[PDB]
Paper text:
Structurally, the c-MET receptor is composed of a Semaphorin (SEMA) domain, a plexin-semaphorin-integrin (PSI) domain, and four consecutive immunoglobulin-plexin-transcription factors (IPT1-4) domains in the extracellular region, a single transmembrane helix (TM), and an intracellular KD. HGF, the ligand of c-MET, is secreted as a single chain 83 kDa precursor protein containing an N-terminal (N) domain, four consecutive kringle (K1–K4) domains, and a serine protease homology (SPH) domain.
In one-half of the holo-complex, N, K2, K3, K4, and SPH domains of HGF I are arranged as a C-clamp shape that packs tightly against the SEMA domain of c-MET I. Totally four interfaces are formed between c-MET I and HGF I (denoted as interfaces I, II, III, and IV).
Author numbering:
A (entry chain A): 34 to 55, 59 to 290, 302 to 344, 351 to 384, 389 to 430, 434 to 469, 495 to 722
B (entry chain B): 26 to 107, 111 to 304, 311 to 626, 634 to 654
Write the structure that this text describes.
Amino acid sequence: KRRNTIHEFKKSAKTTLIKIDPIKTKKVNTADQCANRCTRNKGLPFTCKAFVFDKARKQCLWFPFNSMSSGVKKEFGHEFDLYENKDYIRNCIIGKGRSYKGTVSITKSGIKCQPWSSMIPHEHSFLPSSYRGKDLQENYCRNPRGEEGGPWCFTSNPEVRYEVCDIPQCSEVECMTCNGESYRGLMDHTESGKICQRWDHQTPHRHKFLPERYPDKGFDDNYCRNPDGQPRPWCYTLDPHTRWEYCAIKTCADTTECIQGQGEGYRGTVNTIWNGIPCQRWDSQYPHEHDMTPENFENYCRNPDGSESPWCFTTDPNIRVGYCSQIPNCDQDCYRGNGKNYMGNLSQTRSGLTCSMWDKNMEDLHRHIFWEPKLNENYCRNPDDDAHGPWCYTGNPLIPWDYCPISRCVVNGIPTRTNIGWMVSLRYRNKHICGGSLIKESWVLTARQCFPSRDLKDYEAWLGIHDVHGRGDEKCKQVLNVSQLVYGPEGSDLVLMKLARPAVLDDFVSTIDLPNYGCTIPEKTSCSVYGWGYTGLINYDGLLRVAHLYIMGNEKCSQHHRGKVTLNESEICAGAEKIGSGPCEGDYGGPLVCEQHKMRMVLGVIVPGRGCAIPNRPGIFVRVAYYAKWIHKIILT
Amino acid sequence: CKEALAKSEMNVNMKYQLPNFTAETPIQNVILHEHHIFLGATNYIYVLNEEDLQKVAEYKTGPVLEHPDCFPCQDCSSKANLVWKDNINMALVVDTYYDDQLISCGSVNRGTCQRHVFPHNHTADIQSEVHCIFSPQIEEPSQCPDCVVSALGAKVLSSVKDRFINFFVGNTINSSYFPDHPLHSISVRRLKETKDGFMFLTDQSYIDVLPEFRDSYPIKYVHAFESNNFIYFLTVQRETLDAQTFHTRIIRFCSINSGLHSYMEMPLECILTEKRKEVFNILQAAYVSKPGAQLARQIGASLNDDILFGVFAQSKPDSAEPMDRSAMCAFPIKYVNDFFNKIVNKNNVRCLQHFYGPNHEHCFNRTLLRNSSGCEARRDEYRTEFTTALQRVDLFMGQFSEVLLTSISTFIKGDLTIANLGTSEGRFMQVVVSRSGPSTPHVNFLLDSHPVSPEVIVEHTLNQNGYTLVITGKKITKIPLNGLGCRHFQSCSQCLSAPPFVQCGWCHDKCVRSEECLSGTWTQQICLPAIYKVFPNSAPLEGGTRLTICGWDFGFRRNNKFDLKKTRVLLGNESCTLTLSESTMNTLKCTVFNMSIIISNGHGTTQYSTFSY
C-alpha cells in the first residue's frame, strides 16, 4: 500500500543540516511522501534518523543522522526545511513503549543493558538482524516486539537475563493550567491514544487554523493546543472519521472597574447590562443552560470568551447574553493664543519629540530673551505669549525649540532682463522643482508643497543662474548641499532650508530682507515675481521670467472666487492687470517682493492653488509678516 | 389556524409609481451636484433633474473603436481597420476646488479619463468641454501616470490636501494585462495645476503586488472613504497567499501628498453567536455615517462620532461568492483606530505578504514603535499586516440570515437609526436598527428583478425634505425617506409597531393616518382582540375538547413583546380555560343555548356570538 507517516515526523523551518564528516537527493514533489518513504520499512539501507527538503530544490534528501549527532552544522537556509523523527526525541514512554529508539541501556536495577550484538551472556541477542526497522540499538534497550512492558534489556548481569528498562510515561511533564490555552508542549496524543495531525496539513480534516495565519499559538507539528478555549487543549484527529478529540493532560504545579482591553483578562463585580438586567451565576444554568463552568477556568459580567464587551446571561430568559456596557475604559484651546493663557499638561512637541528640562531651558530663555520676568516644567504652556500658540523647548542640539500640538482659536512670462540672486533653483532629480529665496548667507525659504522625499542627500541648491540649468552662465553658478529643512507652524506650510555650507555673497547672489512684522500693505501696490516654471509658451528657453502684480483687499478676491474662500490673515491677495498671467507649475515657492519706499523686501510666496493664472482673478499668497517673528525665534538656532 | 389568517402580515407586494428614470444601458455610477444627478453608464453619461427625474442632458462615449497603434486620446477616426469595445464608466467625481468640473473616466481607453466643465450661465451642459487627462511622459515612459482606470477594478477617492487634488485609487488587476499597460494596485495620482495630467510624487507613491502572485491572490476593492486623516479601504482578498479562502479587510493609512506612509491592513469578521457559528467573509456594501442617539449609547459614541456599516455575506467555500446569507455590522471608528494603534501586541504584527514576499530582509528582523508611533511619516515605511481581526455581533441577529443583501445606505431620525437595506434580489426595505429587538420592514416591497446596485445616494435637507436614489438594472428611483403609507398594515400591532414619522393609527378597521378617519375613530393605543375563527362551536359546561381560536391582536402589547399572561378569556360569566403554551397573540386554546365568547386582551375586549349549548 501507500501510507502517510510524516505525521509522525517533526519539522523545523529554514535550517539545513550539514554533516561535515559523512545521504542522497532524488527529485520528489512531496516531502511528505518523502518522509513516508524514510519511515517505510527497508526503504534505505542507512538509518534515516531525519529528513530535509527544499522546495526550491524539490530534491528529496533523507539524512541518516540527527542534529544531535556530533559535528553537524545547521545553516539558516530559508529554502531548506528539516523533518525530525520525533521518536528519537520522545525520551519517554507512550503506551506500550512500543517504538523506542532512545540511547538508554540502564536497567531498572541500574545495570548496563548489554550490547544487543553480544551473545554474552544471554542467548537471545540475534534480534537486530531478525527485527530490522525496530532500531534494535547496539546496547540501548528497545521494545523489540512492541511489548506492553516496553524496552526490556538483556542485562549484562549473570543472575538476571533481562531487566525491564523504565522510562516515564510522557505526560509526567505534560502538565496544564486551568485555561490550558497558554500551555504549548509536545504532548501530541489525544485522550483515546489517537494522534494529532500536522497543523500545516489539510488532510484528513481541512480545519480553519492556518498556523501562519494564526501564529503565536504554537500550531507546530502535532502539539495539542487550546485554540478555541476549551477547558482542555484538543486537536483534529489524524483519523478522518474522528472529527477531533481532547488531549489528556494533568494540571500543573506551583477585578477593578476601569476596563483594560476587551475586558478578557479584566474581571468584574458588575453584572448589570445597559438594559439594567442583572445576570446570574456560572453554576446557575438558568434560564437557559450555559456551557461555561468554573471547571473551564459568581453571577458577574466577566469576559470568559474575551468578547468585545464582557457579557452576562440576562435573568431575562429571552436574552442569552447581556452586555454590561456601562463599564468604563481607561482612555484644545480657543481664542487664547498666548501660551500663558493655557496650562498645558503636555510633554510633546509638534515634531513628536518629548520636551526638555525647563531649568536649562529657562536659563537659555532668560539669556536669549529679556522680554519680561510661573508655569510647570516640560509642559505645553509657553511664557513668551507666542502667536503661533503653545510650544516647548527640545533636547535636540540641532533644534532646541518646537511647538506643542494644542489646537487654539508664470503664464504670459515676461523674462527678466538680468539676474536676481534672491531666487534659488531647487534641484531634486537634478532639475528645478521650485523657487526658493535666500535670506541669510545660510538660509533659504520655500513652500512645503515642493518636497517629495524627507531626506537631504537627494536635494540640491543651485545659485546664480539666469537660465534654467546654468546653461548660459557656467562662469558664476554654484551648487550647495542641504543641511536641514524646517517645517513651519501649524497651517504655515513654510519650510526653511539651511544648506550644508553658507554661500559667501557676491554681486549676483543676493539675500532678502524681511517685511516689517506688524506692517500692513497698501492696496494695488505693484510688486514683482520671478520664476522658471510653467508659462504656457511654446518653448521655455529656461530664462527667469518676471511678472508684476497689484495688491487688493479680501473683497475682489472672494468676488472672483464668488465665495470660494473666506480669507484669513495668513493669506495675502494680489492680482494682475486684467490680463492672464500668473505663477504655475514649477514656480512654486517663488517670491513676491515689495519696497516700503525704495528698499524692497519679500511679502508673499508662490503657493499652488485653485487654478493657474485665470485672467482677472486674484491669487492668494502667504503673509510673511504673519510669521516673521517665528522665523527670527528660530533664527536663534 | 395560522396560514388562514396570513392576512395578518403586511403584504410584501404593494406597487407604487415612484420618481423613476429609465436607462438604455446598465448603470455604473451616480453623482449628485447642484440639484443634478450625473450618472455614468455603459458608453454614456447623463444628467437628471433632482426633483423632476428628467434627463436634462446627456453625452455619449458610445461604441468605442480601439487601435493597437492608437493612444487613448490621439485621433483614430481616419483609421480604416482595427477592437470594437465599450467603455463603462468606472471612475466618476465632481471637483469644485479648482473649478466646477466633472472628472469622468472611460474603462476602455487605456483606462484614461476626461474632464467636462460647466458654464455659470447654464450649469448643466457637458458637451461644451472635453479634455483628456493624458500627460505625455517624456521623462520616464516606464510608468504611464494618466493611465489610471483599471479594467478589472476601480475604487476612487478624491480629496483636496495640501492645496492639491489627490486621487487615492485602488485597482484590481490581472497579471496578464500588465505588459499592455503597467498599472498599480493602489496609486496616488495627484492632479497638476495645469490640469493636463497626474504626477507621481515618488517611487513609494504607488503600491502593487509582486509580479509573481499577480495571477493568484486576487484582491478586489469594494469601498473607501476619509476620516481623521486616515483614508480607510474596505476590500476582500485571500486569507493568505495559500489559504484560497477570502476575508474582507480594512486598510488604514495617512495622507501625505508623497504616498502611503503607515500602511495597515486588518482582518474584519462578523459573527452571529448564540448561547452554547456563522461568520460572514464577504462584505457586500458599506456606508460610513453618523449614529442615531439610541445607537450612540448602544454601541458607545456620541451623535457625531463616525460608525462604519458593513453588510457582510458568508462566502462560498474557497470562493468570494456569497452563500446567499447576509447580515450587517457596525464599527465605531474610535474602536478601529485604537485597535490599529494600541490594542495589538508586538508579536502579532506582520509584514505585508503580497508586497514584501515572505523571503526578505525586512520581514525577518524589523519591528514597530506602536505605542510610540501614530501617523508618523518615516522615510522607511513598514507595511504592516495585523494577524488579529476585529469581529462584530450582527445588530440584526440574522433577521435576514436566510438571504444575501446586495447593498445598504444609512440614515437617522431623532433618536433612532434606520437602515435602508437593499436585498440581493432587489427587495428594498427600511428598518429601524437597535440592539433591542428585530424590527419589521415598514417598507419591504419588490423594486425590480435585477440586483440593487451598491451605488446609493442619501440626502436629508433640514431633516424634513429627504430621499435616497437607488439603482437597479437600467432604472433609478427616488424613494423619499419619509415612508410611503400606513394602509398596508394589517394589525393594530403592526400599525403601532411602525415608526412615528409615519402616522399610523387603527381606524377601528385598519391602520390609517389620523385625518383620514371619517368616523374619527383614529387610535394608536388600544389593540382590540380580533377573532378569525373558533374550532369548534359546540361545547358543554363539562364536556371538553380542544378549542382552537384563530385571529389577531390577542396578546398584550409591550413595547416589543406581545404577552399572553396579560389576557383573560371568558365564556360569559364562566371564564374559559387559558392554555398559555398553546395560546399566543395569534391563536388561543381552551378546554371546557346560544352564547358569545369574550376575549379581554392587554388593551381591549371582544365577544363572539357563534356558540350554543
